[PDB]
């Protein structure tokens, strides 16, 4: 019913933020809604993470539309302060995108979170 | 319009990079008969041959042949109906089984073919990326399977 | 295969004499088979 949906629980939020930090270290993370949008256009997004506390929430509501058209999983986390910190940057992040790579060192970890997000949707 | 079937994307030249454990095996009618003659259990015999779980499969054509064989081969029919053996439907008029198996491996490069028929084995050998299982000696033998 | 690489050395073909330069390229066997074959084609058709 609320615009930011589905919102991950506390346990899933930590598991999501774990993968975001690893992808940051391996150069497999795109930070910001603008960069996230380009990944969807190129079809190189493994899934999308959004911040539910964005002010206003509407500036990132184009992303779920692009995802559902492209059949890309997406999920909302409660805090952009926490999302940006785990992204490795010094500022809040409202949206991030895990880039597709079947030759990545964190492939198993990424697919584990992706499977749970599909269950959430 | 002319038709040239595409090469399967599961093939790296002569190597089938799709067939990985657990395996799916298409059983031929005579494979069951030679299996009984050598006292080789189908599920255990395949698990010993490949060191992996094998998912044996019997098509309608093969099941029809086993039934037409008669009372002499009663044992083979009962073994064919073991619940661990799954069944594949056929949508072609003929009950000839050798052509049925050859068409399936042409369509999908994911099956091992288990057969002792001399004619069928040459036909399968020409199709690239198709491992060929058979019972010889005391146990099963597999030819074109690099993972072994 | 008991051959050495020296045994398989390239033998180089000679060219027309300078004094004979005005007469043109010095024909060799591979050249001759082309005009020998071409002539036979004309004579066979011309006979028919």
């Amino acid at each position: 019913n609320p615009k930011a949906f589905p919102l991950a629980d506390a346990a899933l939020t930590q598991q999501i933020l774990d993968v975001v930090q690893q992808a940051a270290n391996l150069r497999q993370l795109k930070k910001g809604a603008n960069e996230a949008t380009k990944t969807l256009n190129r079809g190189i997004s493994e899934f999308i993470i959004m911040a539910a506390d964005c002010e206003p929430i509407e500036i990132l509501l184009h992303l779920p539309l692009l995802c559902e058209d492209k059949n890309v999983p997406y999920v909302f986390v409660p805090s952009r302060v926490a999302l940006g910190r785990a992204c490795g940057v010094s500022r809040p992040v409202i949206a991030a995108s895990i880039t597709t790579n079947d030759a990545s060192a964190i492939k198993t970890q990424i697919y584990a979170v992706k499977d749970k997000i599909e269950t959430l949707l | 319009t002319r038709n040239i079937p595409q090469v399967s994307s599961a093939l790296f030249f002569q190597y089938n990079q799709a067939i990985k454990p657990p395996y799916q095996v298409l059983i031929d009618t005579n494979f069951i008969n030679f299996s009984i003659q050598k006292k080789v259990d189908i599920v255990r015999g395949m698990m010993d041959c490949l060191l992996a779980k094998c998912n044996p499969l019997i098509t309608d054509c093969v099941m029809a042949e086993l039934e037409k064989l008669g009372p002499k081969y009663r044992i083979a029919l009962k073994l064919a109906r073991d619940p661990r053996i799954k069944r594949l439907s056929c949508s072609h008029k003929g009950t000839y089984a050798d052509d049925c198996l050859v068409h399936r491996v042409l369509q999908h490069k994911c099956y091992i073919v288990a057969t002792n028929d001399a004619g069928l084995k040459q036909r399968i050998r020409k199709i690239p990326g198709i491992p060929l299982m058979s019972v010889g000696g005391h146990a099963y033998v597999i030819e074109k399977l690099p993972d072994v | 295969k008991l051959v050495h690489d020296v045994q398989k050395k390239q033998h180089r073909e000679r060219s027309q004499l300078t004094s004979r330069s005005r007469y043109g390229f010095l024909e060799k066997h591979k050249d001759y088979v082309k005009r020998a074959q071409d002539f036979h084609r004309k004579q066979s058709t011309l006979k028919v």
Partner: protein
Amino acid sequence: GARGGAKVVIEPHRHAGVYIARGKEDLLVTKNMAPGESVYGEKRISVEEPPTKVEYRVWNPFRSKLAAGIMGGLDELFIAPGKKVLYLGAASGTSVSHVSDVVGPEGVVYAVEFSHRPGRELISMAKKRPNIIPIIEDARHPQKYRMLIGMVDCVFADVAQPDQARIIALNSHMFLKDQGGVVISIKANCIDSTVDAETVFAREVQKLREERIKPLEQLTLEPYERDHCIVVGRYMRSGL
């Protein structure tokens, strides 16, 4: 490549309702049912014919799996002019608009979608195309829109769901004609990532046989997609 003011030669494809634009590069093209505008930002080709200005749209094989089917050389397509088509998985007008172009004014497309956000764009696009009936409903429960759909010539399924075989079976038993066409786009990862694509493609073909659907041809969609295939079958309700 195919820049703005370039000139091309438009000739028909082997398939009715489908065209090829020649040049230094070749393009797959369908005639625009709603001329003057693009649905998803594709290039358009204008031809002056006796003089009225007819328009054409470029069909991108990287955006549409059906177009990837045309490029790869499918033998039979039941989507043709003057046919009713049930399109399952119509996220928006990206590929339904091209299917609407092929069937033409005389045919119709029943575009079924579930999610509401893509459904809004599907409804908006359908207003420009009178031959599209947008049905924002779950394809797992065809009973919910039986009033809205009649008997149909072809069923096209792009639902990227693990239980897509059931959905295609349920919709065909109600709405598809005997000897009708079925065209499924299969994505191996969605159904079973644990096994290889070839195992998935074989399994889906077995489920179709179980549902009185006779497969006719199978095609894999490289270089446009990875681990994707299109299976074309015929609905033989009498017997296989």
